[PDB]
Point group: D3
Chain length 145, copies 6
Amino acid sequence: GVKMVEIGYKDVVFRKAVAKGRIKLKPETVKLIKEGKIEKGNVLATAQIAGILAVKRTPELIPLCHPIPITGVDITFDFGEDYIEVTCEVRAYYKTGVEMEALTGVTVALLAIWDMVKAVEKDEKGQYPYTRIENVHVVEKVKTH
Amino acid sequence: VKMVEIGYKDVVFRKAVAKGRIKLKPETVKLIKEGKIEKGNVLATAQIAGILAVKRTPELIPLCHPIPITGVDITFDFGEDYIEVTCEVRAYYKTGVEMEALTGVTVALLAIWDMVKAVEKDEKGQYPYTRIENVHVVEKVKTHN
Amino acid sequence: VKMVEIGYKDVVFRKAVAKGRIKLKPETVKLIKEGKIEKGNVLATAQIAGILAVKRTPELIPLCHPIPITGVDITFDFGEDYIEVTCEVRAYYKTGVEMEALTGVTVALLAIWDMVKAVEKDEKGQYPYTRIENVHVVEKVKTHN
Amino acid sequence: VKMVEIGYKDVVFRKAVAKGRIKLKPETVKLIKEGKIEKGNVLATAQIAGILAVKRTPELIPLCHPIPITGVDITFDFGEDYIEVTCEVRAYYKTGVEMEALTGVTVALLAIWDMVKAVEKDEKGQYPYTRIENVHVVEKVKTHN
Amino acid sequence: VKMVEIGYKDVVFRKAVAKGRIKLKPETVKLIKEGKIEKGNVLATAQIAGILAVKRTPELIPLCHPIPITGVDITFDFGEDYIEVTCEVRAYYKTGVEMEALTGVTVALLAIWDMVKAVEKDEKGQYPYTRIENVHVVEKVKTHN
Amino acid sequence: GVKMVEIGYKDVVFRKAVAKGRIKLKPETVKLIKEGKIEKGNVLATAQIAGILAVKRTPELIPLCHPIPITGVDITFDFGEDYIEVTCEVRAYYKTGVEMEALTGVTVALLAIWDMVKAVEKDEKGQYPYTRIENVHVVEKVKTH
């Protein structure tokens, strides 16, 4: 069995969560993206949109999450030699925090990047030995009155 | 950016396996194993979340195509301080299913995190030790016969 | 739990018919037939809700498969103190459509309830006369090719 | 038809409890209690499906409003030849939650059906022993502030 | 691109009205008026499609915020060779509702087109005469008292 | 009442639909977008993603549309002195055409542009006297064996 958590009696307070995660890629891929030479499309813009939409779909995806009146979402990127790090900050004034929403936005944004560069990441055998998503974590969770 | 045309391609059996891990406190892994997590059945919830996520893939990842998924299996492997999730997706269609398998493994892991947040957080309500990592495609297969 | 594999099976014509009833005050049933329900067209709303629900079945029932539904018909039969709903779903596929037909009929019945709630409620705002009953699969057709 | 205006009303505590039953072979009911249903954990799947359905109510029932649901509980009661499902929904809002509770209970019942379809079907692949009945609102609570 | 922060803003009554028209053959407008369109009740379907679309706005338009919609009214005006749809949306929140009203009017018009495609097409299966036009915001209002 | 159209017996043929529509904007706005100076984000990339996703959600939005295995979607733009024209081409190999999917993609892409430039389009009074969506039509519908 499962038991969802009641939140109705809790106070409405400002809540902010920041999550980060990264996708390991071939260095050339990182360059191609950085220069906007990926045929399939605008990698970073696609990932931001996918992540922002994903934040709003968190309650549909995570069984016991509650619908939350999200007031803001920011998704940014950091380039590494062989990776791209995505940061997702979610905010709201509510009765339960937004860390799961932040993690969902980060992960879907990373999945979106992967989908956009699948053609250049796969090897001669069509497999993915260089690509992987890692270090997906919550940097901070703020809850203030 | 555009949804790449795949209509001209042959309909072949497609299978993809993705794996990922969530780092948890050893005490948390034990509570799960023992079915002592207050929020509920962690593994069944992660399985369902993942299976539904596979079917939601085209709504979450912009350029993914709608696909007649014929099967999905989500399994777990317990470590001392982690749980590894494996998602295998199958279909008889014109475009592989690695993104669907990655989406399934990802959401399953997020669902585990959500189900365990109360015991994983620290006194400061943070998640210093929790993280999702090594999310990768184990294999992508396509057969004609 | 796992979404059972159906990929190997043959694509055959499949049809399922489900039925269900919603008990109502004979007064309410009267308003409906005359089209005096101030909230609107009860039957049309019920048909639209049921048809949409049929298509949503895979995201509502965890282990159901995405199915290329080719047709859906929702009809009504009036009783002294009830309205019977019939939902018929059709498709050429590898897995029957009984769950889809059951989902369509139940959501149609729920839509009727929502549409007439204001007139069905009693002085205490309760629903002592309203109920959905005998929801069943009238028939399941599966061609053996 | 039009989504009735509720914006002016007061935000008060609201709770609704709905119940429903699914008739099954006493044999099937047995397998369930013992957890021998090969398809998986019937009860957990039913709870998760019902909880998700509660949140999907506004997109399933045309004229229902988006509601900040704060809690949902789905429980079971076993009978000789049936399983009774109870769904309780809570929220602090301007419009009751009876439709949400009815939706959760019905989808939970449909999930059970899907989970045990293979053992409920007869030699002709029909469902002469299966049916969902007496789906009703046990109680609707609305605080007058 | 980012979901703009609105959490700090005051909660005020918001109302927005959007209008749009679909150019149809005069004979088509007549068939609708007379309820002779084979596909069904055109106006009720457009109303429902529009109302559900309003609630779907944040899932469709990337940077839109989830909003506690309190009411939606969709009305029609018949012309000799067109149908004008008006969608009014209301909410008590931190960010206006013009995008929600435009989404509602747009989908309602698309639904009318879908319901009438069989009589609007020409012998070549084309739609030389059908079109949606003059989709605009009639007004956007915000009140404190 | 409504009556969905049965398509199961029809042949699977190549289908292509092209729809166009435009959004009237202030000339300065058109320039800002053209130069990528819209603070809110990448206007065109956001619109393409919104339109492509919208194509896949057509069956959820338009009540009587069928789920279709879309194989390709292309969304392009044309700049005018005071407008932006969006073209959406949808393709599939199926039993029913894709013109409603093309219209949905075009319209949501236009709504997305509107949302992205609301800040610069509105007048001193916060209204929208210069913005409107028009000439939304099907350029061609192809159905070939």
